[PDB]
Enzyme design. Sequence first.
Site, mmCIF file in Angstrom:
data_model
loop_
_atom_site.group_PDB
_atom_site.id
_atom_site.type_symbol
_atom_site.label_atom_id
_atom_site.label_comp_id
_atom_site.label_asym_id
_atom_site.label_seq_id
_atom_site.Cartn_x
_atom_site.Cartn_y
_atom_site.Cartn_z
ATOM 1 C CG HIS A 1 4.858 -0.149 -2.313
ATOM 2 N ND1 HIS A 1 5.039 0.835 -1.359
ATOM 3 C CD2 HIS A 1 4.993 -1.328 -1.660
ATOM 4 C CE1 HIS A 1 5.267 0.276 -0.186
ATOM 5 N NE2 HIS A 1 5.230 -1.036 -0.337
ATOM 6 C CG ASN B 1 7.386 0.900 3.850
ATOM 7 O OD1 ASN B 1 7.498 1.097 2.631
ATOM 8 N ND2 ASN B 1 6.732 -0.148 4.353
#
Lengths: 499, 499, 499, 499
Positions: free
Chosen positions: C72, C145
């Site tokens: 990420h 998410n």
Amino acid sequence: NRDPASDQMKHWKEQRAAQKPDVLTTGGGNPVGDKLNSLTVGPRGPLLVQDVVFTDEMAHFDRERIPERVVHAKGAGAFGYFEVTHDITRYSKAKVFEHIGKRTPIAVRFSTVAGESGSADTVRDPRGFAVKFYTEDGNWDLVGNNTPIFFIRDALLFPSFIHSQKRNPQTHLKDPDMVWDFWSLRPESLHQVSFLFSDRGIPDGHRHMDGYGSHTFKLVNADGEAVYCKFHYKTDQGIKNLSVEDAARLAHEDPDYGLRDLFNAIATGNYPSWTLYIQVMTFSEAEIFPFNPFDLTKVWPHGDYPLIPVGKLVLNRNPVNYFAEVEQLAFDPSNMPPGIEPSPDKMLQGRLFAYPDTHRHRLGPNYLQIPVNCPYRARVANYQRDGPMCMMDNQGGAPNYYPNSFSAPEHQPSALEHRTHFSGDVQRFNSANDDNVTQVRTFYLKVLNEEQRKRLCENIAGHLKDAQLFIQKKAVKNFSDVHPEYGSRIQALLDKYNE
Amino acid sequence: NRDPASDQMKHWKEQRAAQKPDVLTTGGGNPVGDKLNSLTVGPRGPLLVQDVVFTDEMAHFDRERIPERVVHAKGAGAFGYFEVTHDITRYSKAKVFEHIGKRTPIAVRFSTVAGESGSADTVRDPRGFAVKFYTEDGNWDLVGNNTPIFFIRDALLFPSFIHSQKRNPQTHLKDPDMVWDFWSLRPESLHQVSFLFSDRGIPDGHRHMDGYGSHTFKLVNADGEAVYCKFHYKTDQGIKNLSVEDAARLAHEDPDYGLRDLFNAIATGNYPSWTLYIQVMTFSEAEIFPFNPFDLTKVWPHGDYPLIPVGKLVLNRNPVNYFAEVEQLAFDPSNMPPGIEPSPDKMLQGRLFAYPDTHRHRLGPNYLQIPVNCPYRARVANYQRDGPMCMMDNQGGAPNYYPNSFSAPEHQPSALEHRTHFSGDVQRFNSANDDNVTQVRTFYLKVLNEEQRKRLCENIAGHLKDAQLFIQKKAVKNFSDVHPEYGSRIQALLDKYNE
Amino acid sequence: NRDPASDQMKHWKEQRAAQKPDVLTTGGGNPVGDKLNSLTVGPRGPLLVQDVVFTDEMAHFDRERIPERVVHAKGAGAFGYFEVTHDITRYSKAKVFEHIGKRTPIAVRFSTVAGESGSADTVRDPRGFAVKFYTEDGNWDLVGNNTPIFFIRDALLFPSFIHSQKRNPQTHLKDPDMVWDFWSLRPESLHQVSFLFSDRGIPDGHRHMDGYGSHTFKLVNADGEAVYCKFHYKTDQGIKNLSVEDAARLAHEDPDYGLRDLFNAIATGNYPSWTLYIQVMTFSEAEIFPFNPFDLTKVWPHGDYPLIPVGKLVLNRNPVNYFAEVEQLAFDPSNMPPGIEPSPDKMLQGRLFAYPDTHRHRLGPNYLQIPVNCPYRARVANYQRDGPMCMMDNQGGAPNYYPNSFSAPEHQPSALEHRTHFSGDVQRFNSANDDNVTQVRTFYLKVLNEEQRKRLCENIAGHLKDAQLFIQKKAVKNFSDVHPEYGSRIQALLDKYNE
Amino acid sequence: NRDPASDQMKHWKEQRAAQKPDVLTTGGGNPVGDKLNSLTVGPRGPLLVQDVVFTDEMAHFDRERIPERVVHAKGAGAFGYFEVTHDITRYSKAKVFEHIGKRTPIAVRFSTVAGESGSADTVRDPRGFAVKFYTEDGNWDLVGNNTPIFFIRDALLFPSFIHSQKRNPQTHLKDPDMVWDFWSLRPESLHQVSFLFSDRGIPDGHRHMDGYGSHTFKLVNADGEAVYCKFHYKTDQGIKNLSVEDAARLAHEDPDYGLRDLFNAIATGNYPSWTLYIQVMTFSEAEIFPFNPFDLTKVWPHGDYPLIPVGKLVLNRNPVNYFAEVEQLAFDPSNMPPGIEPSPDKMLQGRLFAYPDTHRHRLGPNYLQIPVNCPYRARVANYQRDGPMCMMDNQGGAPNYYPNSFSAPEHQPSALEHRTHFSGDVQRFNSANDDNVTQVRTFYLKVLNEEQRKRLCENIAGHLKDAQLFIQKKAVKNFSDVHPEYGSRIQALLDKYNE
Ligand SMILES: NC(=O)C1=CN([C@@H]2O[C@H](COP(=O)(O)OP(=O)(O)OC[C@H]3O[C@@H](n4cnc5c(N)ncnc54)[C@H](OP(=O)(O)O)[C@@H]3O)[C@@H](O)[C@H]2O)C=CC1
């Protein structure tokens, strides 16, 4: 002529007398022309950046230090080997015990517990006696003390215990109020405290003391059958202690007494050794044992669980560079080869996380790549990659994910753990009140003689006297709970010390 | 069947088909029994800390990343050799040039300048072309770019320059106003900017561009006599560029275009090579040279200072592990073997400090012990010790202080620096107004033909149109100062872009 | 006039038009006299060490970068608040849900998953949607998410999955053979891969996608009664996706599209918001649930477990410095206030360890003292001390050990964890074959319509065609196991792509 | 009742008697329900990962230590103020001297030199006496010793000197052969060695010794006129020493004697203070001075260059947290406000680089953001950004490049350095044989009386007797060169000590 330790440089020169001295270089391997005078404009002018010889040397000087160990910071080291003398293959399948005669390279650190890097060697403190076995199934780290037991029996009290032993966060001084406020609030300390303040609190160097694993551990044989065990390594040189009087003189006369004694012994061929034994407790002796067999404040009595010999630890080599080989040593209790497993000891369970954790900070993410830490007698192969200071081909171009259809390393099913059954609520069980007095009473009455009891009380009073009265009172009561005469002797001495 | 890069794993397996896969271990060398399922209490129960196999792998995963390079972060690497083809021993005594035919192992890294690790290869930007020579006199790092010149001539403007080229500190976006506000306030940038917005600003991969050391360096021969030099390494594969339209398609189609090109070339045997030339200037010529011969925004014209050939650089090996061998590469312009020395170039003086400094942060204190960084063809010996992640014998029991009566390493008098005389006020001298336009005028008028000038202005206008009008005005005025037509063409295009 | 993002500096200057510019200093607060020219001996002389203005600035430039997130890494940030709108106090006693109307400061980060810092926004990847709630009971990090599910269900597979999604360890290139070898060997990935390759694999920036905690979590009310729950936060702006064609154009036209979209939205008052809902499952319902209710690859269907609304998430403030406020942001799933607990989800059990671990590496031992990481709405008091970069009082002279008779911080018994009963063998249970196909079949047949199924298969074939034939075959078979026509449509398209 | 240091915790509790104790939290601000018992399955079951309370506390315990200082590691600290009493504005324009009566907050750290963190206070060593002034023009670090002079006069000999004073790289023991080999090979050490082995070698605590800046510095007034100066700060409590006999007793009785004395003095109101004086030498006197005026082994005799008083240093506040305020203190001789500048002293030149450099390693890249290092009375504004552990607003959305048209910080021309002219060869000039004996002769004959000379030689011989005979002989010869009777008394005593 003087002791061999002091002739170190003398000897290093003699061993080199034949060859020419090396060319002095920068770290980049560029030869230097003059390293006693700085590049300046004129004899009385300012220093230049161009003087990269100075920068290169100063920057490394500037980065010499790493964080000391958070405990056990003062340390002595040596190298040698472990040899199997007896057959315990019916209990353990570990390669290190595979046949009589088998040798394994070892590395040992000896330490105190509270002192920092500059502290005296001959003080009252437990002694670390950590042993790293370099086996074919990877490294085995038996990270043990000079005592079979410890002051506490749950890892959440550990940072606290250690704070209480170290310096006051404001004054930066050793604080008796901290020490005894902790100890008296947690009477589980009674057993180890009693060991600490008796004669073996100050051993005459590292060669005259025992090592214990202290934890219950689990051994697993070729059939998948398991037993619990204790490790004891007893000194072949004989228990020998220092008196308070002599320990204090040496504390200023030779702060590095233990470190010197170890080095000198090995250098004069007088090689120290220990005899490794185990005790063995079956799973069904563990259910009927009167205390919790995983309580780190408890021993297994010899009467009921006799010592079974396994082999010899021998130290026969000194370090060549102290920093490289003994300051960078990392021992992880979790380094356990097949055949050796953890017990459910609350304290050992904590040490499984703690040590690799601190090592990643003290040394670095790739600290296992440091030669003295390397499992050099095993082939390390897996799907770990990168990190700072990567030192080997990093594994090559091997597939780095698992599973894969490209024949990267495979798991070995024989190396699965022993399966135990457990049942109960998942919660925090209070262990404050497991019998804190019984084994101590035995120690006081049956192991110690008349004189030793007297000194035990004198040693305790001589340090407890500096704590506040309310703290003394409570400590005394804890000692009374072991034996009324234990408390009384201590209290008689405190009455006098209070003027 | 696909390109060689895509078949990497396929090949790794084939090259191995004759063996059995390795045993999967922990970093401590302990065989793992199952590595696809966590140790839990029951099938739908919680994870245990006893799962040290999980922790060991996770803790390493967690520590995989290291800080990217502060500039030149996106990089491609290869290895090969430098071979001497001509004799320049009358200028330099450096072992790397000692006889015709002499081979020296090299390592090379190609990079862009502004983008971070994930950025696209085919963008407008200078290219780094760093070259490490592993000589017997220690490492030599020639840290050069695809251009002979830079945008600025004082190291105090460098962090600024880089800041202006990277992301807005609040929005994290590339910011045209920062780019052109800086460039317009510092017209010394006119030369490099004209190079950057020409065709050569987007090379077709790393194999089709030149290298330059850009700085003026100093060469010292056996007699102690010195000259100044520039290094040029010219592509043997010929200059080739991408058009704006193709460079942009590739930017999304293959962000790693130059990385894949370099790898596949070497793997298919097309080994790319460069010809190393120098330009030489005597100390006398330096005194009468029209501009500052140490001003990094200037070239030495070819007519007056022709290229003298030295050697070939050849890349014939791909890295096996990219992290270990390319991400950890460290070049220091300060690694200079006897016979090569710095000029007083303000910019180069800064680089002497900056690179080793940043390396100690990015990699670490002992980054020079990392294999690719090691001066492995030289014997490193000195009085430096310890530091985090010490990896060799830490130079053993050798005396660690100099001087000593114990025969540790000695300085080598022949490796002293060339002595130059300097005189003047110690003071901060203004270099903002050294000629900023002349050499650029020549470039615009005499090197570029008509079509190239047209594209130059189109590339500039396309990017400058996003800056505020006051910034555009000021930039155009700087371009006018080079040539009125340069200025007016850009302005005609901005008039259109502004609607 | 342009977009607000690009007028950032313009606006900073206007907002300051009233005051005079600050005096430029060294880090040590010493005013500088000239920062454009270096201290040299003569105008064409060498740099001096007594230029501490240069050094001080360069040393900081040299230390600008820190490790990027191990996954990420490409991220966008904003700040705002959560507002309770409905009463769920019967399920959770958490202070954040205390009454309707109650506002809590939040901090959000949006990311892709595989790309490094420099990578394009509009690519096919999952999206991170991490929320930090600053509650009176400490921080609550909901690290979620843009999908309810994930590719794997055991944390021991995590590092591998990530390795396979990233760069080949030798070529440094994205490798379709790694991607699909893994996915085809681990069919549990079938559900999430199906999501990934449908329309929502590329959202139109961050404002047009939902958030999910994915994990089952535990909620505990004032009575000590527990339930299991899922968190869904649906976008109030509406789901909106990019087509492959436009996503690819933007990937070169604006690598930072999602960054810019979010910044401009907030700057123009068009504030994005999400609606927080929960699903609730009782402990009884959890025993009869057809799958494993803690299997990260499974959802709880809406018919049986409807969404129950809780509140609003609103983003109304942009960061002021991106590095300080959004690169240094740390989320720990382990930050859970009383009222919210972990479920036995194998995957979440691993995240409890992994995040604080990586955070200590990436930012530092004391990362929680970084303003944006601080639980500033609560009072931190404990027995933790020291560490690198200690920034407040270090808790003063307060006693640093526990328990103590000196009134340092006390435990709060009402904050104790919910107690659950567990029973079974302690061992590694295989989860490889929990139902891998059923919920996907439902997705394929009942959620998607005709057009979408077509595009789903095209999207899969477009990326799967680059893998080897043996890998294709095996993947296709996994898709056939969901539905014959699913496998078929993919195979017909691969047949074409393989010429 | 006992001394105030011992009652630290007692007083902390009293100062808090009126409030309730704080709630015990995780570092994330989450209240803890129990912190004495670990989360396990069953009372005698294994530890869980879900115990994030344990991990959070252990992880921090694990990262508690940082690298001790590479020299002067054992330290004591206090805070107070500097007050101007006399007018020296004709010599220096610095704001810290701006008018009589002006107060500036200060921080002082006292230290030994060779010992590590746990060594004894009352040992023979120089004492560090570092003073940090928090000026409006930024921090001023006067980093001085308890002597005017040092043992060497070039920075390239510093790492060596230190190595020679610390532990043998193999034995980890203090090595007399190292100590005296160095000192005897470098007779420039004669001056400082004589100081060291004399009565003032062991001061009775820190309150009874003087401080010196030792280096020549430069002072610059408002007119741009400059002079050279020496800083002397003389104890208001009077010189007081310990005898060898008492220093040795105390070394085991109270290893932290100096630390306890300082804290107790301040706590009981008896606030120690020092009187700041300078000596002044005009540029023109510097040219005729019989020695090198920038030679750190030389003093300026009081007859020719009398002390001029400047102000008072008073220490009136103890630290509250030793680690936060004393262990993390960083002093940079390079922090100099306008009005104070460096001389060309070779040694000082090296300190300009060394300190910030080591601080970045020891504390971190952003160590100046640590409260006690902050220039909290200046406004820090520049173009420096980011780094690990960035703690403020990182200077917001301010333009991060220079120059700029957006009104970020500007240079302040009045704060330019004094300009001096230098001329000579750029080369390494030998300073090994500047007069090494004249000032030492004077000290021996004219400053010491009969008894003191006797003790000086007894102190020297008591330590030099452990070194090898060839080393003894050489040192004695160096001592003869100062005065025949100096060398001869030392030899008479060594003859006896060698049996
Ligand atoms: N069983 C064990 O593992 C040990 C028990 N103890 C103590 O002895 C009590 C009874 O043990 P049991 O096995 O029934 O009795 P035993 O008499 O068989 O064992 C006596 C043990 O005590 C050790 N010991 C002797 N003096 C001291 C001392 N001053 N400090 C620390 N240890 C000492 C001895 O070690 P050595 O072999 O060197 O003489 C010996 O191992 C226990 O409750 C415990 O307090 C102590 C150590 C070990």
